[PDB]
Design an enzyme around this catalytic site. Structure first.
Site, PDB file in Angstrom:
ATOM      1  N   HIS A  41      55.025  34.918  64.027  1.00 10.01           N
ATOM      2  CA  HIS A  41      54.859  35.789  62.992  1.00 10.01           C
ATOM      3  C   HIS A  41      56.131  36.131  62.307  1.00 10.01           C
ATOM      4  CE1 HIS A  41      56.767  39.471  64.606  1.00 10.01           C
ATOM      5  NE2 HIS A  41      56.116  39.145  65.606  1.00 10.01           N
ATOM      6  N   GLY A 143      62.193  45.296  64.233  1.00  3.58           N
ATOM      7  CA  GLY A 143      63.150  44.535  64.136  1.00  3.58           C
ATOM      8  C   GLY A 143      63.493  43.990  65.601  1.00  3.58           C
ATOM      9  N   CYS A 145      61.423  42.224  67.508  1.00  8.06           N
ATOM     10  CA  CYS A 145      60.792  41.169  67.823  1.00  8.06           C
ATOM     11  C   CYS A 145      61.603  39.984  68.006  1.00  8.06           C
ATOM     12  CB  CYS A 145      59.705  40.988  66.552  1.00  8.06           C
ATOM     13  SG  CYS A 145      58.592  42.074  66.346  1.00  8.06           S
TER      14      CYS A 145
HETATM   15  C1  LIG Z   1      56.296  44.700  62.325  1.00  5.88           C
HETATM   16  N1  LIG Z   1      54.918  44.299  62.709  1.00  5.88           N
HETATM   17  C2  LIG Z   1      53.898  45.190  62.496  1.00  5.88           C
HETATM   18  C3  LIG Z   1      52.687  44.966  62.820  1.00  5.88           C
HETATM   19  C4  LIG Z   1      52.631  43.573  63.479  1.00  5.88           C
HETATM   20  C5  LIG Z   1      51.228  42.978  63.927  1.00  5.88           C
HETATM   21  C6  LIG Z   1      51.182  41.823  64.372  1.00  5.88           C
HETATM   22  C7  LIG Z   1      52.295  41.376  65.057  1.00  5.88           C
HETATM   23 CL1  LIG Z   1      52.040  40.006  66.208  1.00  5.88          CL
HETATM   24  C8  LIG Z   1      53.516  41.783  65.011  1.00  5.88           C
HETATM   25  C9  LIG Z   1      53.690  43.041  64.265  1.00  5.88           C
HETATM   26  C10 LIG Z   1      54.948  43.775  63.842  1.00  5.88           C
HETATM   27  C11 LIG Z   1      55.252  44.844  65.150  1.00  5.88           C
HETATM   28  O1  LIG Z   1      54.350  44.936  65.748  1.00  5.88           O
HETATM   29  N2  LIG Z   1      56.617  45.104  65.309  1.00  5.88           N
HETATM   30  C12 LIG Z   1      57.225  45.869  66.224  1.00  5.88           C
HETATM   31  C13 LIG Z   1      57.350  45.625  67.617  1.00  5.88           C
HETATM   32  N3  LIG Z   1      57.865  46.438  68.376  1.00  5.88           N
HETATM   33  C14 LIG Z   1      58.113  47.839  68.211  1.00  5.88           C
HETATM   34  C15 LIG Z   1      57.778  48.143  66.701  1.00  5.88           C
HETATM   35  C16 LIG Z   1      57.829  49.462  66.623  1.00  5.88           C
HETATM   36  C17 LIG Z   1      57.432  49.845  65.549  1.00  5.88           C
HETATM   37  C18 LIG Z   1      57.116  49.268  64.421  1.00  5.88           C
HETATM   38  C19 LIG Z   1      57.189  47.953  64.524  1.00  5.88           C
HETATM   39  C20 LIG Z   1      57.204  47.283  66.125  1.00  5.88           C
END
Ligand SMILES: CN1CCc2ccc(Cl)cc2[C@@H]1C(=O)Nc1cncc2ccccc12
Ligand SMILES: [Cl-]
EC number: 3.4.19.12
Lengths: 302, 297
Positions: A41, A143, A145
């Site tokens: 992603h 961040g 990820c």
């Molecule tokens: C940034 N995006 C948002 C939407 C989304 C949607 C799909 C996928 Cl495969 C990834 C993400 C990432 C995500 O979830 N990041 C995150 C991962 N772990 C903690 C998080 C705490 C707060 C904010 C985002 C977080």
């Protein structure tokens, strides 16, 4: 003596953490040999999150679109391929800090350490478990990820998790290091919900054996149970069914403490019915389920 | 989201872990520059026992490499073993003595090999509720400040209650403990009040607000109640330290104190805060900020 939630020493994994930037997105990568592994992603834009065609997005990218940073050193991307939900970035330098490693896919109930990273920099290490609903209850901000889950048994690092997303309930979803998600999750912003979580029964029993080894016996009783009677009770408290494999796995702890697995099951049944009554087991007022039978043996022996 | 008991990345400390053998005793040492620091009980009149030892009596092992000892001195309860080789993996470091209530990471070692890392707090009774078996002596506690490792603890012994006692890296014990097999007991422990409040702010940041109430309290009224439940007195310095968390959540420190006051008199009532049925006191106000903002090392 003592029982702590213990993580593996993160050193061997810290040496593999790099920062991966594609366009405006910046996340973490795992640099092992001449490959950097990161969530696919990272190639997604704002309107390419609900329904992204990753093969289509990746075919439009060139090596120089991916900026990889290892400390203050920009690594040169010389190739890119996608394996399920992981992006594999071939780089022109093999990581000298690459440890002995394996890619292992874990089953629910298994534990692993997480090295939380932001912008390729390790900020913290914690221990957690793959929940029966295939989510992990981590501590992750935006961040994080690309942060990885691992076990360092002996001198080999077994990579088992790569963080990909946070579900609406604050729980986290990710993949093994081959890009295969744990659970029915997809790397899209579509409505996704974690299944109803359950308690990892085999881990609670292992943690009750850890308490017996540390001199805590207040919860033990004169009863035993059939495996079927235990599972009928356990199901009512949202506990995972205890299988014969679990009973066998608990064998060494049963032999070491002198308490038959089905006898400990009767203690658990009673705790479920009565609660703790102001008492604690290993400094906890709840039944802990994030210590496997293997963790208990390792921590209570070596 | 999420709140976990989180330790600092142990990497910089792992490079410093060596095995120290003297006679039949084998424990861990901390190799920083050309000196290996370890508990003096590896060798009681310690001056008399050390004067009978020669450099070649101490076998120091860094991985599969034997480090040759070229000198030995004692500083309080720590033995300093001068070695021929300076540790190439020596990070930027300081020796700091911590106060009870402060937290740190412990890299547990057996035979100079790091086996686990965990987070713990220096209890107000000067003991640590650690996880140690035989061979763990010499394992160290540390914090990370930017890229500098602040060494604050060296493990020496286990008390009869399963709790642990150790020294700072200058050999000064934390608490009224001595390094010998004798009748020693940990004092009555107290709850680290400032840390519970910080952990209540961490719960508010994670969307847990059930314990909040409309009430506030005076600092004196809170301390009279806290003393009744074996809680450490909350000082004005603690209130000031909780300031940023109070500003971030919009809940005044004395307002959060009235929530802690109701939790102490009434309990949780089958409810949990951050997945816990007990009030957690091993997260400092800085730990909460660091975990709920994302500081890296
Ligand atoms: C940034 N995006 C948002 C939407 C989304 C949607 C799909 C996928 Cl495969 C990834 C993400 C990432 C995500 O979830 N990041 C995150 C991962 N772990 C903690 C998080 C705490 C707060 C904010 C985002 C977080
Ligand atoms: Cl597994």
């Amino acid at each position: 003596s003592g029982f702590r939630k213990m993580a593996f020493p993160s050193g061997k994994v810290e040496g593999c953490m790099v920062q991966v930037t594609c366009g405006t997105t910046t996340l973490n990568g795992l640099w092992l040999d001449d490959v950097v592994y990161c969530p696919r992603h990272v190639i997604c834009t704002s309107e390419d999150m609900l329904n992204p065609n990753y093969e289509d997005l990746l075919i439009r990218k060139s090596n120089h679109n991916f900026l990889v940073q290892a400390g203050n050193v920009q690594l040169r991307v010389i190739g890119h391929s996608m394996q399920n939900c992981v992006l594999k970035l071939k780089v022109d330098t093999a990581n000298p800090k690459t440890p002995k490693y394996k890619f292992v896919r874990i089953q629910p109930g298994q534990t692993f350490s997480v090295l939380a990273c932001y912008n390729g920099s390790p900020s913290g290490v914690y221990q957690c478990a793959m929940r029966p609903n295939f989510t992990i209850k981590g501590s992750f901000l935006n961040g994080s990820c690309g942060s990885v889950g691992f076990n360092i048994d002996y001198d080999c690092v077994s990579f088992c998790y790569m963080h990909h997303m946070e579900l609406p309930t604050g729980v986290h979803a990710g993949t093994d290091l081959e890009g295969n998600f744990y659970g029915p999750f997809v790397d899209r912003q579509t409505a996704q919900a974690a299944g109803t979580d359950t308690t990892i029964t085999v881990n609670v029993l292992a943690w009750l054996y850890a308490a017996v080894i540390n001199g805590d016996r207040w919860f033990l009783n004169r009863f035993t149970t059939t495996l079927n009677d235990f599972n009928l009770v356990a199901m009512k408290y949202n506990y995972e069914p205890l299988t014969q494999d679990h009973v066998d796995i608990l064998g060494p702890l049963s032999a070491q403490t002198g308490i038959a697995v089905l006898d400990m099951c009767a203690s658990l049944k009673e705790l479920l019915q009565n609660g703790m009554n102001g008492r604690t087991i290993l400094g906890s007022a709840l039944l802990e389920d994030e210590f496997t039978p293997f963790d208990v043996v390792r921590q209570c022996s070596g």
